[PDB]
Ligand binder design. Structure first.
Ligand SMILES: Nc1ncnc2c1ncn2[C@@H]1O[C@H](COP(=O)(O)OP(=O)(O)O)[C@@H](O)[C@H]1O
Ligand SMILES: Cc1cccc2c1C(=O)[C@]1(O)CCN(c3ccccc3)C1=N2
Ligand code: VO4
Ligand SMILES: [Mg+2]
Ligand SMILES: [Mg+2]
Length: 703
């Protein structure tokens, strides 16, 4: 049994190393210690000081360098060192910030990235490979109770699986974290584990879905070299016997704007680099491809390579995944034609004509795009610069200037890419959905909280999604838990854990009074609206009124929202157009006539191509966002949730570099210490009267 065998890999990689006699000496010491701030300005930078004396209300302790005094009520005592490395921190004698951080630090120093924090798992990103996810590791966890084995993402996965069987109830695994924290990597491990322990081709296809989604939906940002630019909820489906019977991927709104623009040092989606790097000699000839430097959509950020990544090798992996999932050779070629055509479209250079209208003097890129997409270049050209619209009921050809022609070209590109992405997901789902499920375990992997030098509409929706997920944790850990105690009248005094995202949520998504998204929508159908009338409206409603909103004095085009994870300043430029998400009908007519079997589906299949109406306007992105989020939240409320809190160690994507204030900020806004306290102070288990304890109105509550 590897669990008891101290030579095993399990012991080596998942267990705290045996301390030595010098450490035993320290462990049985009568000395007592405190965590203190050498600099009272720097509340997150702690050192250890020996407590040398005490009064009834104070401690005196030595500093690393001198003696200081502190009220006992303000003291962060250090735990006896026998607790250092503890697997479940609800066991600590002293639950404070530097103690919780210290335990995570001891474990992390030994590459022990997983730690329990009472009922939920904490996962600190190692930023290096640790060999704890082999089949041999999977096999050790299979069937084991949480307290029988070391902390691991596999153990929580197994717990949910047995709960699903024993309780005949759907489960969810909700993996939280800021950008780069490890949500996607842990999501993949859960799927790996479930497919293995409950498996019977289908399993291999479930796994191979991932390189396809990542190639098209992930990109280098300044926060993560492999950032998910779309959120997903993966349902792993099980029959009544508990075997895997299928899977379904709900994908959420994709950051389409990245196709046409990337900030300095970032990349576009990985697939662009993968094609250019990995294509055959005359794949490249057939698609008129050159290197990334030659394409406007890949040559702006100054970054075309990711350290440690071979895009040509990744392309091979993407294509192998497409084969396994079952995309035909013709389908793959059309996918790649769409990618190439998008790059060509980006190379179209509109110029001023004799008048205000734009012209295309060089048609090389137009012609190359049209050839690969299988559309008529003359029709495309007219649709870009001279699209027809109604004015009342009259049909009027516009003549767009350079900036509008360029923005229409970008709108086409983003629609092609977003529709392509939806089509990939649909094709995958058709393969993976082969049986009506009896049960599911859903794994949620959102785009995580993020802050850049410039934050736009996409960042607000992303950060709002993270705020809502944190609120879901708060609801389940604190609110529902105490509501139950209180309804069962079990002698409980209600505790205000001071974690409530409600104010920020209402600010963003309020309906009456209208919140930010509501006002955005109102401005979006207002014919005279501009990005300036929009910001003016937001300030008018919220400035000096809403405690989570700030009208900055340093800018006229930004507003601040205080999120659980910190204040973010949002730039309003392009929000009206981003929300309306327009696309000239004439461009759709052009592509509806494509000779390509995949391109034609993107434009004629209503599930991919149609857009809902709300009265006399197309549904806005904000309304679409809201619908998708409401849908997810409704599904989650039908499951039993399990939470995994991913924690990023630093903001450099480096191993062995745990940063105090980076980590402590997350422990605070995540509610980790609050979550430990409710575990300790409360009554986790209750049973209708069955036939340290509490008798309720209908149930016996226990610890
Ligand atoms: N458990 C892990 N083992 C090894 N590397 C990891 C682990 N978790 C995260 N990483 C590294 O951190 C990067 C970002 O993690 P990821 O899961 O993509 O973040 P996100 O939370 O943004 O989905 C990964 O690409 C990988 O290099
Ligand atoms: C998880 C989730 C649920 C509902 C909507 C979501 C997400 C998400 O996590 C996202 O798919 C990530 C990006 N995003 C988005 C992109 C552009 C504009 C607006 C939003 C997201 N929207
Ligand atoms: O960087 V992550 O968007 O995958 O949170
Ligand atoms: Mg991710
Ligand atoms: Mg600024």
């Amino acid at each position: 049994n590897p669990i008891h065998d101290r030579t095993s890999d399990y012991h080596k990689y998942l267990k705290v190393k045996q301390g030595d006699s010098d450490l035993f000496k320290l462990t049985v010491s009568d000395k007592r210690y405190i965590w203190y701030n050498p600099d009272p300005k720097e509340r997150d930078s702690y050192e250890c000081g020996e407590i040398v004396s005490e009064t009834s209300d104070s401690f005196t302790f030595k500093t690393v360098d001198q003696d200081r005094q502190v009220k006992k009520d303000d003291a962060n005592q250090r735990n006896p060192i026998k607790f250092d490395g503890v697997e479940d921190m609800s066991e600590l004698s002293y639950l404070n910030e530097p103690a919780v951080f210290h335990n995570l630090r001891v474990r992390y120093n030994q590459d022990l990235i997983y730690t329990y924090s009472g009922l939920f798992l904490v996962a600190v990103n190692p930023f290096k490979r640790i060999p704890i996810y082999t089949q041999e590791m999977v096999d050790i966890f299979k069937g084991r109770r949480r307290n029988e084995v070391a902390p691991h993402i596999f153990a929580i996965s197994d717990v949910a699986y047995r709960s699903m069987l024993d309780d005949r109830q759907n489960q969810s695994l909700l993996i939280t974290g800021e950008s780069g924290a490890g949500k996607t990597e842990n999501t993949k491990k859960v799927i790996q584990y479930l497919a293995s322990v409950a498996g019977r081709v289908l399993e291999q296809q479930i796994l191979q879905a991932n390189p396809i989604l990542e190639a098209f939906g992930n990109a280098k940002t300044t926060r993560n070299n492999n950032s998910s630019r779309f959120g997903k909820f993966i349902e792993i489906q099980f029959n009544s016997a508990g075997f895997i019977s299928g899977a379904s991927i709900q994908s959420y709104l994709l950051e389409k704007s990245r196709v046409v623009f990337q900030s300095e040092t970032e990349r576009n989606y990985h697939i662009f680099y993968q094609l250019l790097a990995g294509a055959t000699a005359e794949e490249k000839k057939a698609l008129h491809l050159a290197g990334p430097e030659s394409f406007n959509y890949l040559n702006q950020s100054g970054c075309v390579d990711i350290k440690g990544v071979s895009d040509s090798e990744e392309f091979k992996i993407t294509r192998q995944a497409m084969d396994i999932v079952g995309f035909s050779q013709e389908e793959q070629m059309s996918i790649f034609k769409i990618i190439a055509g998008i790059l060509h479209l980006g190379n179209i250079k509109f110029e001023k004509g004799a008048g205000e209208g734009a012209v295309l003097k060089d048609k090389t890129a137009l012609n190359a795009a049209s050839t690969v997409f299988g559309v008529n270049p003359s029709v495309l050209e007219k649709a870009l610069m001279e699209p027809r619209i109604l004015a009342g009921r009259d049909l009027v050809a516009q003549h767009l200037n350079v900036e509008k022609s360029s923005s229409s070209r970008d709108a086409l590109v983003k629609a092609l890419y977003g529709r392509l992405f939806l089509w990939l997901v649909k094709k995958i789902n058709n393969v993976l959905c082969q049986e009506r499920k009896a049960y599911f375990i859903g794994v949620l992997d959102i785009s995580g909280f993020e802050i850049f030098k410039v934050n736009s509409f996409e960042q607000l929706c992303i950060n709002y999604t993270n705020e809502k997920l944190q609120q879901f944790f708060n609801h389940h850990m604190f609110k529902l838990e105490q509501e139950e105690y209180l309804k069962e009248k079990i002698n409980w005094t209600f505790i205000d854990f001071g974690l409530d995202s409600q104010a920020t949520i209402d600010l963003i998504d309020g309906r009456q009074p209208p919140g930010i998204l509501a006002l955005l929508d109102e401005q979006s159908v207002f014919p005279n609206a501009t990005d300036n009338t929009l910001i003016t409206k937001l300030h008018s409603h919220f400035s000096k009124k809403n405690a989570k909103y700030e009208e900055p004095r340093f800018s006229k085009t930004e507003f601040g929202v205080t999120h659980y994870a910190g204040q973010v300043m949002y730039e309003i430029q392009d929000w009206l157009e981003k929300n309306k998400d327009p696309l000239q009908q004439d461009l759709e007519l052009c592509f509806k006539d494509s000779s390509d079997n995949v391109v034609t589906k993107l434009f004629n299949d209503p599930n991919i191509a149609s857009r809902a109406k709300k009265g006399a306007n197309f549904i806005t992105v904000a309304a679409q966002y809201k619908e998708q989020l409401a849908s997810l939240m409704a599904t989650l409320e039908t499951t039993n949730p399990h939470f995994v809190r991913c924690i990023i160690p630093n903001n450099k994507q480096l191993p062995a570099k745990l940063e105090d204030k980076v980590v402590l900020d997350q422990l605070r806004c995540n509610g980790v210490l609050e979550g430990i306290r409710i575990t300790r102070k409360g009554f986790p288990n209750r049973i209708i009267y069955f036939v340290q304890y509490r008798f309720g109105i209908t149930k016996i509550f226990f610890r």
